[model samples]
Target chain A: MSLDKAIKEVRGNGKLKVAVFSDPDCPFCKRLEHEFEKMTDVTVYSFMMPIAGLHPDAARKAQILWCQPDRAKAWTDWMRKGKFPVGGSICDNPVAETTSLGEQFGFNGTPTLVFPNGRTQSGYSPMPQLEEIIRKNQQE
Target chain B: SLDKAIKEVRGNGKLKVAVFSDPDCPFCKRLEHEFEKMTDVTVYSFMMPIAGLHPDAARKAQILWCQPDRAKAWTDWMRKGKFPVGGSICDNPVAETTSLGEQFGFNGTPTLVFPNGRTQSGYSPMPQLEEIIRKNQQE
Candidate 1:
């Protein structure tokens, strides 16, 4: 839930904030990221919470993405374009911490979006719907 | 009448419905229990495996699809806790059905689409389900 433990990306004014617990290899996670790419005036904090049981390579991919010089860009490129960061040195990453955070929240699925009102939705939403959520949750 | 259904069950044939279901989704199983009680409907089940949430669902779905008697296989698994075993090497519609389900704008399992094109996502009890189906059948 802490912003410090996520890959932060800001679009436009960045006044509205949303946090996402996303898996590196989840299809809906990719869909959610594509929707995020089409939005504006919001800040997204992506917490890497890969489920290794489902996606065998997801944990390693998350580590590779987290170890990149630009975590935000690396995550965006990977989720949006299927591009993996090349040759980034492995380092101590927040994957486990963020995963623990997600587990504490008790969401069983990936691409869980946490709004400012503390409400959560565990699926993909279109850009306009996401914008509506941002607008509604902007008071917090 | 969807040709893409992996399994189809004929009851009394008074009503028709289609469901996008995951092999490992608990809600889908609950919905199947409700479907079992209905004797005046035909049910078409499409494979919609959410692999990230249920890693084994895709394979299980493929197994169901590959069965000689899909309806019996599905009923055996859903009702009796008898999971269909064996290889999923045959050409199956698991991935295609997943894509079609997503295209239908469904984000969750046990999405029941009635004959009139109304959709209800999640498990509905018998009374409410009957009411919805009858009402949808009117239109």
Candidate 2:
């Protein structure tokens, strides 16, 4: 819930927390996430960013992912299969909260990854590059 | 050019919208057309023309700068199809702006940087853009 425990959620050894600010519909996020899970479950602590100027009908779909029984399944289903989740947003959602945070952090685009150690990366990160990041940061 | 642009646009009013646009860019022209319906807006301009795409953009941007009044020149060219009537060549910020845009990570025309430092690309409706600026102002 707090920034301290936030990184503990993932981005590390499953014991270390990490936060991934991503859009469910963003293809770049999917590209990076192709090997994202291999990094000790960093995607586990993820939230969707809301900026309609950049994406049409994105955040609401992200809220659907958050509401699913398994966020991993929902994210994979939509990102890979284009099977967007259905919902009316009746439930409380964190999309708005993370959206504000994304704005505050000045991240105009989606699929930005944040480490608990305060290191942040924007855009896509394929496997080799991602492993380099994980290995470098985990050393720090 | 960056600081001058920010000061000039912000000087016009409170809402500061920094736009990276190209004269020969159709998308930028459409966005410019949209803004013509409005009045008394404050916007910072950064000429980041992709000559590869719009070959004459750098030339047009230079022409705009060579004018006696840049704001008026830009407005006239964008609003009407009036080309910047030759005022004798002088050095312009086109190359500098191009480098700056590349450094700033601009990929497309009509990129908007809000007062809150949030950057966006592509064409956005006037009302939605106004709402975004207003909300950023509030924060």
Candidate 3:
């Protein structure tokens, strides 16, 4: 919900900013990650909202991804290549915080992308679709 | 996946409906009572036990599916408070149904998926349930 609670990723100039509530093991979220990767001059802030009911191991993986030295890199690697870090001690993670936040926001599913204007989309979108929405919601 | 549902036909069975339901969920159990009163509807129950809420629900669903008569076992358990007893080691569709519910973005039990792929979550009384189903049937 807050900027500090997110794993921020800046690509190129980072002129545009968007926030996303993601589940570690959700297939749609993985697809969304690829769409995010195709963009430039935009900042992606990811908030972990792991649903244990859907993915039993997601909460654990989210915590591990958060505890890694490079959280954004760890998250990307995990989503794209299924690469996970082995040894990261437990830390103050935002998995539960974002999970409850997402529930409060009525997000029943993963890859809930929040635009700069606060509009939310609840599923995966192609690169072009994402770009159009991002541009429409971009701050002037 | 539709073929694996516990099918129940009431009256003429003209209306087709599906529910992602949990055995131990209170709302789902309440909805079951409403389902019993309806006519001309075919219900397809997909076992989607939410273990976080009802700890023993998955086990009960598995036991129910493992019974010789799946529809009878589900109705007996939901309506009469009769828990089905059997080994849960059978090749059941509990896990598959749960994942399917997840794919549909349903967070809770007793989620009604109509014939047109529209969904309504939570329990509804017979009157409201019929109205909702009737509206969806047109779409």
Q: Each candidate's fnat, in order?
A: 0.00, 0.00, 0.00
Worst 10 residues of 1 chain B by lDDT: B1-10
| lDDT of all predictions | 0.77, 0.63, 0.81
Interface CA root-mean-square deviation for model 3: 18.0
Residue B106 of model 1 has an lDDT of 82
Score candidate 1 by DockQ.
0.01
lDDT of 1 by residue, B1-139 (tens): 2777854555667788888988766557656767777777888899998886557788888888788888888867765567666645488777998999989888777788887878876556566677777788756
Clashes (N, CA, C under 3 Å) per candidate: 0, 6, 0
Chain A only: TM-score of every candidate? 0.94, 0.76, 0.94
Clashing pairs for predicted structure model 3, backbone only: none
Cα deviation in Å at residue B126, candidate 3? 1.6
Off by over 4 Å in 3: A1-140
**A1-140 in candidate 2: lDDT tens per residue?**
12211111244545434456777667787776666655664434566775677678776777777777666666766765677656634267666766775665456676777553334678877777776775554312
Q: Candidate 2 chain A: minimum summed lDDT over ten consecutive residues — where? A: A1-10
